[PDB]
Design a protein around this nucleic acid. Structure first.
Lengths: 91, 96, 57, 132, 185
RNA sequence: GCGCACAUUCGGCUCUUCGUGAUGUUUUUUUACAUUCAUUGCGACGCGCGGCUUCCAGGAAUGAAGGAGGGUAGUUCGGGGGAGAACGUACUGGUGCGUCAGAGGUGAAAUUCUUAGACCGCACCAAGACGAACUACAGCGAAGGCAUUCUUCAAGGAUA
RNA sequence: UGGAAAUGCGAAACACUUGCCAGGUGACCCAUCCAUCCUCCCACGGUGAGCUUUCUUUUCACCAUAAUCCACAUCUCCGGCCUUGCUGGGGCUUGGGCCUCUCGA
RNA sequence: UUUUCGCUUCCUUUUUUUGGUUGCGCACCUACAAAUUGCCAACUCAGAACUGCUUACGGCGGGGAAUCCAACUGUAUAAUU
RNA sequence: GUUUGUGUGUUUUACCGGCUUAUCUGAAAAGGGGCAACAGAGAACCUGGGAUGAUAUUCCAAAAAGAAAUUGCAUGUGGG
C-alpha cells in the first residue's frame, strides 16, 4: 500500500547498488516504460517490448524507434532536417 | 482559428455528427452539409470519405489538426478524426 | 474450424468452408478492409492518370 | 443523397466478396421490414471466363457467362461506384417483383440483359474482377 | 498476389514490408534507397556501404546514421563522415537507405548487475565475466606472479609485438588521463 | 415656431407602383417596350387600407463604471522571449603554394621559431567562434538579462 | 451454390503455377493470479458389507472406458396432418445488427 | 405540448402531407417501502464469560556495543584453505 | 404423318470427358550429400477378462470380451 518517498521502482534493489546509479537508472525507468503517443491513432499506448520495440496498442502499429524512449531528438531533428533538406531539395 | 471558431459555433448551434460511421451515414443521407477531417486519419478513410463527400458535393474541410484538438473543440473529450456537420445554419462561413 | 496440426487431415472441408477469397482464413473485417483499400486506391490511380491526361492535350 | 439504380456499386460480404452490383432500387430507409436501410440490388456473382485467341473448336462459348443474383443488402455493405449501368430499358417500366419467383424471373432476363450490355458494350469494367 | 518482399536490416520505424522503390528512382522517404552521391550533402543516411554491394557495412551498429560531408563530383568521390572521428571517402556511387538507426544505443543506460551482464553478452561465444592479467597464471600469461598485485614492465609496447608478448596497450602514443585532446587543435 | 396653396420648389428614389408571366403600343426611339403607359394575370413590395385573426411581449423590470479593477477590439512599437535558417568577418588551426635570414617576444630580455625551414605574403580550406565601428544618459526586458538577416513561433507593452 | 450481416451446406467437385498465403497450419520463455475443468478430499444422504460385551450412528465399500450422435420438449402445432420451422443450455470469445452514449458518461 | 416516437379517427391547409384530434403503442419507478420476509450457509477473526495451573508434544532467531577488512548477491582450490 | 414422350443400336459422326502409350515444350541455391533427437517437432485402441506358473493398451475368436480406430487394396452397388 505504501509508495516510497523518492525512488519508485528502485525499492527492488533496496540499498544495494548505490544512489548515483539509482539516479542513472531512475531516469530510464521513467522513459522507457511510459506509455507514449501513437502517431496516427493518437493516444499514448506505444509500449516498449524487447529493447525499445514499440507497438501501439490500439492501432497495432509497430515502430522501430529505439532505445529507451523511442525517436531521439536527434532523430526528430533529423527528421526535420530531412524535412527541410529534402523538401528544399525538391523546393 | 476560423475553422475552429466557425465550427465552434457550429457545434453550438449546429448539428453535426462526430463518429465515423455516423459520418458516413450522414453523408449518405446527405444530411451532412460538410465533412471535416483531422490530420489523424487512417488515410483510407480520408479517401473513402472523400469519395463520399465529393459524392455529396459536401465540403471537405481538412481541418488541419488533431484528435484531441478536434474533440476539444467540438466540446468533447475523446480522440477525434472526423466530423460531418449535418446542419448548422448560422455558422454560414462553414457553409461558405 | 480451429484445431491443431494432426487434426486437419481429418478436418472436413465442409467444416472448413465459410468463406470469401483469401479469407477462408478470415471472418469479415480484415477482409473488408483489404477489399476496400485496393478498390479506392486503384480508382485514384486511374484518376491520377486521368488528371494528367487533360494537362497534356 | 445520390444513390439510384443503374449506378454501380461494389458488394462486400455475404457471398459477394468485393463483387459488383447495380442499384436497382434503393431502400433509403430502415423500417421494421428491414431494420436497416438497405438497397435492393441486382448483382453478379460470376464473372465470365476468358475471350482470347481462337480459343477452342466451337468455341468456348462455355466460358462465355455472367451469373447474376439479386439481393437486398445493407447500405453499410457496398462501395458505390460513380459508374452506372442504367436501369432504363431494364426497369423503369419493367420492374422486378420480389417475391420469390419474381425475383427469379427478372433475374433471368436480367441475365440476358446484362449480357447485352456485356456483348460488346460499354463499361466493360463492370463485369469483372478487381485484382485484390 | 505476386511482388518482391521488402524487409531486412532495421532503421527507423516505418512499419515493415513497405513499398520502397529504389535506387535514384527512389523518391527519398526515410530509409529509401538512393545512391549516396545522389543523396545530397549533409543528408543523414544510414547504413552506407563502403564496398558497394554490401548493403550497409558502415554504421551497421545501433544508433547512428552518418553524414555526407562531401561530394567530389569530378571523380564521383564522396567524403562522408564515419561516426567515428573518421571520414571515409568512398565513391559517391554507393547505395544507402535514408536515415538512422531506429535504435540509439542502450549504452547510455546504466547496466546494474552481473546477471544483466550475463544475459547481455550471450548471443555469441562466451566472453565475460573477466578476470585480469595480474594473477592469470604466469605460464600462459604475462602478468601472473610478482609476489603481489602489479604490472611488470611498461604496458606500452611496439605494435609489432609477438603474440604472448602482445596484449594490452598497444603502442600507446599517449595513455592515461586525457589531459589534452586528440587530432586537430 | 408651426401650419400652409403645389411635388409643377431645392429634394426623395421605384413614395413618378414593384416584380414577373407576357401580349400590346414602340418601328434612324431611351432597340424589346414588363412597372409606369395600353392590354391583362398572379405574386407583390413600398405605402395604405381592410379583415383581423390568433398568439405573444416590459420602461429602468436588473444604481451610477472610479484620472478602481478587468478585459475586450485597432494599426503599431521595441537588442522581450523562443525556435529557425543565412552570414559577414576574424581568431586559429590547416592547407596551397612564394620565398627566405630571420623570426619572435620584451621593462631589460628572457624563456620562443628557425633555413627539414621559422616568420612572411597571397590563394584556399578546414574548424570552432563571434556578430565587430555602426550605436547611443539611446531602445527593450520582472529581474537576472537582452544587438546580421531572414524565416518563423508563440509573447509583451504602450498608444487608439 | 444459403442468410444485409456476423455467418450456410452429402457433394456449392476443380488438381500445376504463384520473388503465394506477418497462413498460432509445426512455433514454443517464464510470468501472473484468477477463473474454473480434471482429479482429488470432506461430508449428507442412502445402500450394502464388515465392526462394535459396561457407551456410541464405527469402518470400509458403494463404480462406468474409449469410441460416436445430439432430433426431447418448449416453440412450430402438444400429436386432424402436424406440415413454418425444426426455435430453444450454460458460460468464456469475438463478431454482427439496431439504436447511437457528448450535460460526458 | 414551435422537435424526426409511431400509427388510427376526425378537423384544418390542396393534402388521403404536416399540424391539431382521437384510440392504442413508443421514451419516461412518475409502478418507486422494506426489500420485510423465506431458506440455507460458513469457519475465520473477535468478544465475553465460566474454569484451573502447566519452562512441559512438536516444531522454536540470542542480543548489544565498536575496530579492521570486502560494496553487494555471485565465484572457488575435487580431497587441509 | 406430325410434333412430342420413351426405350434400343456394339450405327455413324461430330464434340466433350478420361486414360495410357506417345511427341514437343518445360526448375535454382544456408543449401549441388546424406546422417544427426530411446524426451523437441512427433500422424490409427479403448475399457473388461470364473483372464499366466512366469507376458500382454500384443494373449481373449465367432456369438459374451466387446466395442474401437486406421491403412492398403480391392469389389458391387449406391451417389454416378
Amino acid at each position: 500500500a505504501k509508495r516510497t518517498v523518492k525512488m519508485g521502482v528502485m525499492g527492488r534493489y533496496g540499498a544495494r547498488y548505490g544512489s548515483n546509479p539509482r539516479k542513472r537508472a531512475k531516469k530510464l525507468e521513467v522513459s522507457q516504460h511510459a506509455k507514449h503517443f501513437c502517431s496516427f491513432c493518437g493516444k499514448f499506448a506505444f509500449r516498449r517490448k524487447a529493447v525499445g520495440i514499440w507497438r501501439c496498442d490500439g492501432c497495432s502499429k509497430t515502430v522501430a524507434g529505439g532505445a529507451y524512449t523511442l525517436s531521439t531528438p536527434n532523430n526528430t531533428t533529423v527528421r526535420s532536417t530531412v524535412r527541410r533538406l529534402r523538401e528544399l531539395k525538391q523546393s | 482559428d476560423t475553422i475552429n471558431t466557425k465550427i465552434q459555433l457550429v457545434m453550438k448551434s449546429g448539428k453535426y455528427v462526430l463518429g465515423t460511421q455516423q459520418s458516413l451515414k450522414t453523408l449518405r443521407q446527405g444530411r451532412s452539409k460538410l465533412v471535416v477531417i483531422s490530420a489523424n486519419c487512417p488515410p483510407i478513410r480520408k479517401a473513402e470519405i472523400e469519395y463520399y463527400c465529393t459524392l455529396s458535393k459536401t465540403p471537405i474541410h481538412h481541418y488541419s489538426g488533431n484528435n484531441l484538438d478536434l474533440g476539444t473543440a467540438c466540446g468533447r473529450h475523446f480522440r477525434a478524426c472526423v466530423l460531418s456537420i449535418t446542419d448548422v445554419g448560422d455558422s454560414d462561413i462553414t457553409s461558405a | 474450424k480451429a484445431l491443431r496440426h494432426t487434426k486437419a487431415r481429418l478436418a472436413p472441408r465442409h467444416q472448413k468452408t465459410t468463406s470469401r477469397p483469401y479469407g477462408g482464413v478470415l471472418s469479415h473485417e480484415q477482409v473488408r478492409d483489404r477489399i476496400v483499400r485496393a478498390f479506392l486506391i486503384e480508382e485514384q490511380r486511374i484518376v491520377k492518370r486521368a488528371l494528367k491526361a487533360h494537362a497534356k492535350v | 443523397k445520390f444513390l439510384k439504380p443503374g449506378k454501380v456499386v461494389i458488394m462486400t460480404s455475404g457471398r459477394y466478396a468485393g463483387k459488383k452490383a447495380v442499384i436497382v432500387q434503393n431502400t433509403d430507409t430502415r423500417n421494421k421490414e428491414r431494420p436497416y436501410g438497405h438497397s435492393l440490388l441486382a448483382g453478379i456473382k460470376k464473372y465470365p471466363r476468358k475471350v482470347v485467341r481462337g480459343m477452342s473448336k466451337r468455341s468456348i462459348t462455355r466460358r462465355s457467362q455472367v451469373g447474376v443474383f439479386l439481393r437486398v443488402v445493407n447500405h453499410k455493405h457496398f462501395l458505390p461506384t460513380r459508374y452506372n449501368m442504367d436501369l432504363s430499358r431494364e426497369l423503369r417500366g419493367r420492374i422486378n417483383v420480389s417475391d420469390a419467383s419474381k425475383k427469379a424471373k427478372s433475374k433471368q432476363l436480367v441475365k440476358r440483359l446484362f449480357q447485352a450490355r456485356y456483348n460488346a458494350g460499354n463499361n466493360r469494367w463492370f463485369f469483372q474482377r478487381l485484382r485484390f | 498476389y505476386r511482388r518482391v518482399k521488402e524487409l531486412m536490416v532495421a532503421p527507423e520505424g516505418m512499419f515493415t514490408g513497405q513499398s520502397m522503390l529504389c535506387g535514384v528512382k527512389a523518391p527519398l522517404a526515410i530509409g529509401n534507397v538512393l545512391p549516396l552521391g545522389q543523396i545530397t550533402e549533409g543528408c543523414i543516411v544510414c547504413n552506407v556501404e563502403a564496398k558497394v554491394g554490401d548493403r550497409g557495412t558502415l554504421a551497421r551498429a545501433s544508433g547512428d546514421y552518418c553524414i555526407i560531408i562531401s561530394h567530389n563530383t569530378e571523380t564521383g568521390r564522396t567524403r562522408l563522415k564515419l561516426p567515428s572521428g573518421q571520414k571515409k571517402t568512398v565513391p559517391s556511387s554507393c547505395r544507402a537507405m535514408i536515415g538512422i538507426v531506429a535504435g540509439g544505443g542502450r549504452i547510455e543506460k546504466p547496466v546494474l548487475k552481473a546477471g544483466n551482464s550475463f544475459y547481455r553478452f550471450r548471443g555469441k561465444r562466451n566472453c565475460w565475466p573477466k578476470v585480469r592479467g595480474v594473477a592469470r597464471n604466469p605460464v600462459e600469461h604475462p602478468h601472473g606472479g610478482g609476489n603481489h598485485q602489479h604490472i611488470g614492465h611498461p604496458s606500452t609496447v611496439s605494435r609489432h609485438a609477438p603474440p604472448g608478448q602482445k596484449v594490452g596497450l598497444i603502442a600507446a602514443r599517449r595513455t592515461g588521463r586525457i589531459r589534452g585532446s586528440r587530432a586537430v587543435r
